[PDB]
Amino acid sequence: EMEKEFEQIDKSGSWAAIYQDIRHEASDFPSRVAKLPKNKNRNRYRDVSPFDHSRIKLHQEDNDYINASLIKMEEAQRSYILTQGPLPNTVGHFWEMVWEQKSRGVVMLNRVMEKGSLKCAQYWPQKEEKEMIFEDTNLKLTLISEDIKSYYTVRQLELENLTTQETREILHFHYTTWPDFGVPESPASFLNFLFKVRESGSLSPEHGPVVVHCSAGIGRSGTFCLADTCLLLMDKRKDPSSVDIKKVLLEMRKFRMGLIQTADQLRFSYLAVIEGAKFIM
Numbered sequence: 001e002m003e004k005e006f007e008q009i010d011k012s013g014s015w016a017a018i019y020q021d022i023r024h025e026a027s028d029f030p031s032r033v034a035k036l037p038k039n040k041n042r043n044r045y046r047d048v049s050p051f052d053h054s055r056i057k058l059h060q061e062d063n064d065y066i067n068a069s070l071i072k073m074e075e076a077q078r079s080y081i082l083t084q085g086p087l088p089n090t091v092g093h094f095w096e097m098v099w100e101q102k103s104r105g106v107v108m109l110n111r112v113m114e115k116g117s118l119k120c121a122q123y124w125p126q127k128e129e130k131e132m133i134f135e136d137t138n139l140k141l142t143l144i145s146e147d148i149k150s151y152y153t154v155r156q157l158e159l160e161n162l163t164t165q166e167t168r169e170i171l172h173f174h175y176t177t178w179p180d181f182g183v184p185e186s187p188a189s190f191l192n193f194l195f196k197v198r199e200s201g202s203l204s205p206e207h208g209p210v211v212v213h214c215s216a217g218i219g220r221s222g223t224f225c226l227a228d229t230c231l232l233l234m235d236k237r238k239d240p241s242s243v244d245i246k247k248v249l250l251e252m253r254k255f256r257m258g259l260i261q262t263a264d265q266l267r268f269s270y271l272a273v274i275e276g277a278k279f280i281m
């Protein structure tokens with residue numbers, strides 16, 4: 001059981017070592033499309049690339065590339081798209097991907113500015129009466145409503161395909177309180193956020209996969225998916241303590257490199273799952 005494993009790693013302070021074994025065991029697959037010169041300005045970080053086998057393809061004949069990966073967790077019946085915070089020049093691509101994949105939810109785990117630098121373009125409207133048009137992808141986005149709370153904001157958005165005049169409602173889940181350095185002290189507010197996303201229906205198989213991003217789409221984004229999938233496996237399995245976080249992380253890392261960036265984020269993931277298991281058992 002993971003609780004005893006937690007105490008062991010913690011009491012021995014072995015987190016940096018566990019994390020290094022995961023680094024060394026992690027899959028490595030080609031990422032040739034990401035490294036093409038014509039795609040250089042579609043990547044925020046030169047060291048964070050989608051694998052060719054799991055990359056999301058835009059349905060535009062010119063350039064189908066976006067920095068986004070499909071993570072398919074077969075046993076849990078959960079899919080996620082992990083992507084980078086959009087760039088000024090990829091906001092239109094981001095919303096085209098949301099449209100083409102039939103996603104119902106966008107989960108954002110960063111602020112637009114952290115540590116006095118821009119981590120992300122402002123890719124959604126700030127006011128009802130000031131909608132955004134993406135000329136390159138023929139989409140209109142309108143803020144319908146905004147519900148600001150202590151730890152997170154939920155926004156209802158309407159996305160319109162200007163080519164077909166179809167509209168969809170998108171839910172924007174913005175966790176606003178992840179600290180600039182390190183990880184939250186308690187996982188309580190993160191778990192509350194995760195249960196709110198679940199309650200919306202955004203993670204349900206009647207929709208396209210949820211879009212999850214932070215700045216790089218690997219660290220905080222990784223913690224979100226790892227906790228959701230681990231808790232879902234503990235519901236599904238005859239023996240809940242058969243669930244090995246480290247194995248689940250390595251399965252997820254087949255689909256996108258670098259998920260969970262620090263030993264701190266690994267420890268936090270354990271803590272989130274261990275605590276979330278109490279509300280589930």
